[PDB]
Curated annotation (Swiss-Prot), chain A:
Originating gene: S2
Recorded family membership: Belongs to the orthoreovirus sigma-1 protein family.
Misc remark: Mutant ts447 is temperature-sensitive.
Protein name as annotated: Inner capsid protein sigma-2
Effect seen on changing A323V: In strain: Mutant ts447; temperature-sensitive
Length: 418, 49, 245, 147, 98, 140, 351, 49
């Protein structure tokens, strides 16, 4: 139902003594304006696929997402102090403008003369403590989108989290007729538009918007795994990928008429997340996580089991509980093989095509592995050189995460959902 | 006045999207209005070295 | 194309209108009446030989530049999209035509009938042709077309089931291609409208049943369109006399 | 004619392109005439570019007609002889046994004709295929061929 | 295989490298001559401003070329943007000037 | 709300960023204008061959010409048109008088109707005569 | 001026907005726009129908008109009075502090009323399909509707042969469907504060004097001042189901993308329009597919780019099936009919 | 195209129908097709035509 508690969690130190952000990155982040509550500050629109966006200070989309989460974690420390002022202290030479947190600006000279603010690492804050934010209901809905997104990123040391739900009651009224309008579009475009639309006005659960976004997420994840395809469709709908396993994948919604699957009645759901560091170069997973955060902004999803998250991420009043659903992790290289196996068994794809798909996937994985390791080591030398401006351009990862995890179990669970 | 042709108003426990075809044609229903965009086909042609 | 394999050369190409599970009049298409596979066309050998013997490239040719400059103006005037839309319209029109004709002819097409209580006759080729011509003009004016649409079908027994094409080898083998019809939204809507008409005939000005002519004089104010049961007799009423030709 | 033949390559199903009968040697021709020899040369180089499937048979039979009175080849029935005009061989049922099976031509009686038949059988051009269009988006309208 | 993606809502435009990454309009680039020659007008319009004022440096691979000299007095201000822009704008897909 | 007329009738701060100048002069080969003129003729739709089909009242359209001779006449028109397009007395490419013997060829014409009979008398006329043979009048 | 999306060069500020409208950022006669990268010769294509071509290429194809819009009511049955009558009444008008308002009625006030078929009797359309089916009231003669197909050698102008009734009815139904093939259009609303329907958002049809249409659209708006059959019918109805019911979350400016509204209509036409919309929606494509198709067709000699902005309310119906293409090709082959005049221009033109 | 032949019920005479039937049978016995004509002409012309 409607969410009753609004809480969020900040980012944690990766062994440093401060938030892994500095003045240069903070200044370079603000490209769409002085407001950190805009979608362009988080994402970008390539509009043609077939490419990876990179920069000197922002190597990857995951890099941008992590840096923005760090910036928000650092800046929100100020207004949530018990004194509740918003411009009497500075964080890395930035201050808030106006009590409604409209924008971030360079600090005044006297604030600059005053000492900066020391920020703790893993803090959980409630949105109702701030007087203005508690007083204005329309105000919360605009910022809780980003708050939910950063919380879903910072809950676990692995990649972002998504939500998958299968149910037949969602197809209640003219939802089928309305979804029939999305046939020609791509998943990235649909997700971008839906993420933008969420902030226009408050919406209620069980609404057409919520049912649409849940159905779209479920369809995308089922097609990604391979449960539903051209010869096995979920009410004639299925997502098709032009070349599986490529560096930049394009998924397009599509219709197949006579072939349709059988779905048992009831309500089923789970959570999924990628564990390989490869997710930093895949926009689709990030978009799905952002859409899940938008959904969480207005709805109350089932809680998350404590034992599936680190100790600091336990017993959040609205996110984690004593007994909850497990988190399912995977790696893209193994998911490609699972997809190919299911399609070959169903007869859509042949052995030779599977062979080319596997080879291309291996090449892509090697390329991304090399690039990520190079950028990580470069960050290491920069941190060694400068001891007062420590920073991370990308979320830290370990060598262990590069291997197979629970991919088979998660694929089996997703297949069991249908 | 035939009440059966105004079911969604007369009937107190009918879903707002119920029709009674082909036996009875109702005269009060739910209509969906749209506004699409139809752009022309645009292309930029680049030469190959 | 077959180099010198005589047993596999093509000889005849034809088009058929009837389904494969029926026996009908053999009505071959006009294309089969050619001695060659297609319409003959003569050429001059001297020009071809001269062209083969005397040709040259420009002294400064770059294929990339030449073909870019040749492709760019050509593709700026394409019509493939309009052609695709016209193709969809044509397929819809053919399906609706066969569906409608099956309801007034003796065609064995498996479609449910809803207006069989309305009197009619067993139409022949000319009657079906006139009806189909009216349908053609109706759809053409509805979709603002001006060029051909189903005109070739309106020449000889428009009563048809499904279109197919064939060609024949010299040794006697034949190859037959039968496209798979996906469906017609217009035909489905027409069927739904007929189903509704089956119950809403009065709103369209049509009355169902029979009439009784006889003198009734009274001051009662019952409507003649809802007569009392005391004034109606049927084929089972005792004393009634039934007449034939 | 050259460009028309190139265009007609694409419409084999409905249009058949053949060499006009006026391009053949007059009255069958003879190997004792320089003009007839040049006629045969021009026709031989022009024939392989058409879509007519009887072109090899016509190419063989024009020389067979021109060589009458000097060389002889066997024939199937008594009705048709070596003097039948090459233009008439327009249908596959008219292909002679001597052309179909080279062994029937004796090198003693028809040396030049044997070589000509062998050349036709061994060096006539071979057909091939190519890819075109975007079937995934636009679709295809091919009927007897892959899309 | 060069593709240019326009920027939106303050983002910067990007072009595709041969490795497969998309990069902004800054840094050091290496261009074969034929690429600019075949995409003259588009490349001029998209790159001249960043070359003149930004931080973009491009190495054009040519092999051999004729050159022209213009001598200037060293005690006064002097700029070569007019000459360079003229050269860049009169490059054409079938010829180049000195 | 802008109406679309029907085709047919039915029922009833500085500016001027650098690099925007136009000083390039490139002569395309082949020329643009030459290519467009050729492609305009190619994209023409095909002719309507409605001969032999019924009409609004059910009468077959077209002239009364024999099936065989109709094809031969159409062949002569194509050659005559082909010669004009090449601006020659005759055309090298001819659709008529080839070496092939197409004696059995047939082409559509208005001589025959859908039932397979002759059109010596219009179909509408035939119906009127048949139905008039059964007319009865008032008694004196 | 210049567009930084396609590198086109423009002269006036309004031209920039008109151009970016094509790219999707916030003249209609154009249907195809191509721009090269090694020269300054853009090419635009318009319909061959234009009265004056301002140096633009022509679309010679006979394209059908698929997308049409209607802003009127989605109904095809109307109630007409047959025998008029006037009855004395006790309540005459509504009075506010010093003003008076007349009492409008949703239904005709007469001795008898009947339902009559009339396609698009209340509709505003940009394009007219021109296949209307219209019936006079049953008092007048309607025999002409059943004698259009083969009643040509009839022996009486008044009347029809009972042997062609099925054909006539089938043609009438086909006309009905063909004329009702349309798409509904979104219009503006207004917030009403009438005591009977308070706070409801009611549509406003385009043009002036729309206030008359409210009584026809929403029967429940009228109160129950007198005692009559109409008043009893109104009193036996619920009040909440009126006007706007639901709206899209995506917004263009301050206007919703789509809306669900309670209003007068008929379910037959509603279903027909829904099926038509589904059929068109199953044909939508995106510019990336066009890029891929054109690049593949070019055989690797040029590359094609089509930049665009994210949206979910654009319709580009161009996707069909190989079976449909084959059927059309078979029809085209049948069209030849052994007529060399049909085939000669094609060979000459490609030559 | 024209139907090759048809059979009809109509007022007629049995004797006349019989006479026409024998006449048609006699004429049909003499029918030849172009292939035999071509073969006979070639054989008579001895291959010179």
């Amino acid at each position: 139902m409607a969410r009753a508690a609004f809480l969020f969690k900040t980012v944690g130190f990766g062994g440093l003594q401060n938030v892994p952000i500095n003045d240069e990155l903070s200044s370079h982040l603000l490209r769409a304006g002085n407001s950190p509550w805009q979608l362009t500050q988080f994402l970008d629109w390539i509009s043609l696929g077939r490419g990876l966006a990179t920069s000197a200070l922002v190597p990857t989309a995951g890099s941008r997402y992590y840096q923005m989460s760090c910036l928000l974690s650092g800046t929100l420390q100020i207004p949530f102090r018990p004194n509740h002022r918003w411009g009497d202290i500075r964080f890395l030479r930035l201050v808030w403008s106006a009590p409604t947190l409209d924008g971030l600006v360079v600090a005044p000279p006297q604030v600059l003369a005053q000492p900066a603010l020391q920020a703790q690492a893993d803090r959980v804050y409630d949105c109702d403590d701030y007087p203005f934010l508690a007083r204005d209901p329309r105000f919360k809905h605009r910022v809780y989108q980003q708050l939910s997104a950063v919380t879903l990123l910072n809950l676990t040391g692995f990649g972002p989290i998504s939500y998958v739900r299968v149910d037949e009651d969602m197809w209640s009224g003219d939802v089928n007729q309305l979804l029939m309008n999305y046939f020609g579009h791509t998943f990235a475009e649909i997700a971008y538009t839906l993420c933008q639309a969420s902030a226009n006005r408050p919406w209620e659960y069980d609404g057409t918007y919520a049912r649409m976004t849940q159905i779209v997420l479920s369809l995308f994840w089922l097609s990604y795994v391979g449960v539903i395809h051209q010869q096995n469709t979920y009410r004639t709908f299925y997502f098709q990928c032009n070349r599986r396993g490529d560096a930049a994948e394009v998924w397009i919604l599509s219709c197949s008429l006579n072939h349709s699957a059988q779905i048992r009645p009831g309500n089923r759901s789970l959570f999924v997340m990628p564990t390989s560091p490869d997710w930093n170069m895949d926009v689709n997973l990030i978009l799905s996580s952002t859409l899940t955060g938008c959904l969480c902004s207005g709805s109350q999803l089932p809680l998350i089991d404590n034992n599936s998250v680190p100790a600091v991420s336990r017993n959040i009043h609205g996110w984690t509980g004593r007994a909850g659903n497990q988190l399912h992790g995977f790696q893209v290289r193994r998911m490609v093989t699972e997809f190919c196996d299911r399609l070959r068994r169903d007869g859509v794809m042949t052995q030779a095509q599977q062979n080319q798909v596997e080879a291309l996937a291996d090449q892509t994985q090697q390329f991304k592995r090399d690039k990520l390791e190079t950028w990580a080591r470069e960050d290491d030398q920069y941190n060694q050189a400068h001891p007062n401006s420590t920073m991370f351009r990308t979320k830290p990862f370990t060598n262990a995460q590069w291997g197979r995890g629970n991919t088979g179990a998660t694929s089996a669970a997703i297949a069991a959902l249908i | 006045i035939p009440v059966e042709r105004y079911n969604i108003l007369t009937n107190p426990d009918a879903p707002p999207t119920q029709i009674q075809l082909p036996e009875v044609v109702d005269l009060y229903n739910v209509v969906t209005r749209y506004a699409y965009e139809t752009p022309p086909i645009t292309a930029v042609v680049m030469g190959v070295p | 194309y077959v180099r010198l394999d005589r047993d596999r050369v093509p000889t005849m190409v034809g088009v058929t209108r009837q389904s494969r599970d029926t026996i009908t009049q053999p009505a071959l298409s006009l294309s089969t009446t050619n001695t060659t596979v297609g319409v003959p066309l003569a050429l001059d050998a001297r020009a071809i030989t001269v062209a083969l013997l005397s040709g040259k490239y420009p002294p400064d040719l770059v294929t990339n530049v030449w073909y870019a400059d040749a492709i760019y103006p050509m593709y700026a005037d394409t019509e493939v999209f309009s052609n695709l839309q016209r193709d969809m319209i044509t397929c819809e029109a053919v399906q609706t035509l066969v569906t409608l004709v099956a309801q007034i002819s003796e065609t064995q097409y498996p479609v449910d009938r809803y207006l069989d209580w309305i009197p009619s006759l067993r139409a022949s080729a000319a009657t079906a042709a006139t009806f189909a011509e009216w349908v053609n003009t109706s759809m053409k004016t509805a979709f603002d077309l001006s060029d051909m649409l189903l005109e070739p079908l309106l020449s000889g027994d428009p009563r048809m089931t499904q279109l197919a094409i064939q060609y024949q080898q010299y040794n006697g083998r034949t190859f037959n291609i039968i496209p798979e019809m996906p469906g017609s939204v217009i035909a489905d809507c027409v069927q739904l409208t007929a189903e509704v008409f089956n119950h809403e005939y009065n709103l369209f000005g049509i009355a169902r049943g029979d009439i009784i002519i006889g003198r009734v004089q009274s001051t009662h104010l019952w409507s003649p369109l809802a007569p009392p049961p005391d004034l109606v007799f049927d084929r089972d009423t005792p004393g009634v006399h039934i007449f034939g030709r | 004619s050259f460009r028309v033949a190139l265009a007609g390559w694409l419409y084999n199903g409905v249009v058949t392109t053949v060499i006009d009968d006026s391009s053949y040697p007059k009255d069958g021709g003879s190997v004792t005439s320089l003009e007839n020899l040049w006629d045969f040369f021009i026709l031989a180089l022009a024939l392989p570019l058409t879509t007519d499937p009887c072109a090899p048979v016509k190419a063989f039979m024009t020389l067979a007609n021109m060589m009458v009175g000097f060389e002889t080849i066997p024939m199937d029935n008594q009705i048709y002889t070596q003097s039948r005009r090459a233009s008439a061989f327009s249908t596959p049922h008219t292909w002679p046994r001597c052309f179909m099976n080279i062994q029937l031509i004796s090198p003693i009686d028809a040396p030049i004709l044997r070589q000509w038949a062998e050349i036709i059988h061994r060096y006539w051009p071979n057909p091939s295929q190519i890819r075109y269009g975007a079937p995934n988006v636009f679709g295809s309208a091919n009927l007897f061929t892959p899309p | 295989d060069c593709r240019i993606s326009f920027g939106m809502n303050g983002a910067a435009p990007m072009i595709r490298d041969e490795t497969g990454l998309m990069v902004p309009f800054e840094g050091n680039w290496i261009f074969p001559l034929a690429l600019w020659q075949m995409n003259t007008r588009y490349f001029n319009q998209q790159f001249d401003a960043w070359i003149k004022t930004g931080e973009l440096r491009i190495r054009i691979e040519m092999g051999a070329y004729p050159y022209m000299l213009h001598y200037y007095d060293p005690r006064q201000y002097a700029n070569a943007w007019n000459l360079t822009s003229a050269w860049l704008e009169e490059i054409t897909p079938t010829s180049i000037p000195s | 709300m802008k109406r679309i007329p029907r085709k047919t009738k039915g029922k009833s701060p500085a500016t001027t960023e650098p690099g925007t100048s136009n000083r390039e002069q490139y002569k395309a080969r082949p020329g643009i204008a030459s290519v467009q003129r050729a492609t305009e003729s190619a994209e023409m739709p095909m002719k309507n061959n409605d001969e032999g089909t019924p009409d609004k009242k059910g009468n077959t359209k077209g002239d009364l010409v024999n099936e065989h001779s109709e094809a031969k006449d159409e062949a002569d028109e194509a050659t005559k048109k082909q010669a004009k397009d090449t601006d020659k007395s005759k055309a090298q490419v001819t659709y008529s008088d080839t070496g092939i013997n197409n004696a059995n060829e047939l082409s559509r014409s208005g001589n025959v109707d859908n039932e397979g009979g002759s059109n010596q008398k219009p179909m509408s006329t035939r119906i009127a005569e048949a139905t008039s043979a059964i007319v009865s009048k008032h008694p004196a | 001026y210049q567009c930084h999306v396609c590198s086109a060069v423009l002269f006036s500020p309004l031209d920039l907005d008109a151009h970016v409208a094509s790219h999707g950022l916030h003249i209609q006669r154009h249907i195809t726009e191509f721009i090269s990268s090694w020269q300054n010769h853009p090419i635009v294509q318009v319909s061959a129908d234009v009265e004056n071509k301002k140096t633009a290429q022509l679309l010679h194809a006979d394209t059908p008109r698929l997308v049409t819009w209607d802003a009127g009511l989605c109904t095809s049955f109307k109630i007409v009075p047959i025998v008029p009558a006037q009855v004395p009444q006790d309540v005459l008008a509504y009075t506010f502090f010093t003003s008076s308002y007349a009492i409008q009625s949703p239904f005709p006030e007469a001795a008898v009323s009947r339902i009559v078929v009339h396609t698009r009797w209340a509709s505003n359309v940009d394009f007219d399909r021109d296949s209307s089916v219209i019936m006079a009231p049953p008092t007048e003669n309607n025999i002409h509707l059943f004698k259009q197909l083969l009643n040509t050698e009839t022996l009486s102008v008044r009347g029809a042969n009972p042997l062609m009734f099925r054909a006539n009815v089938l043609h009438m139904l086909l006309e009905f469907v063909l004329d009702n093939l349309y798409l509904n259009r979104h219009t503006g609303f207004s917030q009403d504060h009438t005591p009977f329907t308070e706070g409801a958002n009611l549509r406003s049809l385009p043009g002036p004097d729309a206030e008359k249409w409210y009584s026809i659209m929403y029967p429940t708006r009228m109160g129950t001042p007198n005692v009559s059959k109409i008043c009893n019918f109104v009193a036996s109805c619920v009040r909440n189901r009126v006007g706007r019911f639901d709206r899209a979350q995506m917004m263009n400016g301050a206007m919703s993308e789509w809306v669900d509204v309670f209003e007068t209509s008929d379910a037959l036409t509603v279903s027909i329009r829904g099926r038509w919309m589904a059929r068109l929606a199953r044909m939508n494509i995106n510019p990336t597919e066009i890029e891929w198709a054109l690049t593949e067709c070019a055989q690797g000699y040029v590359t094609v780019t089509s930049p665009y902005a994210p949206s979910v309310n654009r319709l580009m119906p161009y996707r069909i099936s190989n079976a449909e293409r084959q059927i059309s090709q078979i029809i085209r082959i049948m069209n030849i009919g052994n007529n060399a005049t049909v085939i000669q221009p094609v060979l000459q033109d490609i030559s």
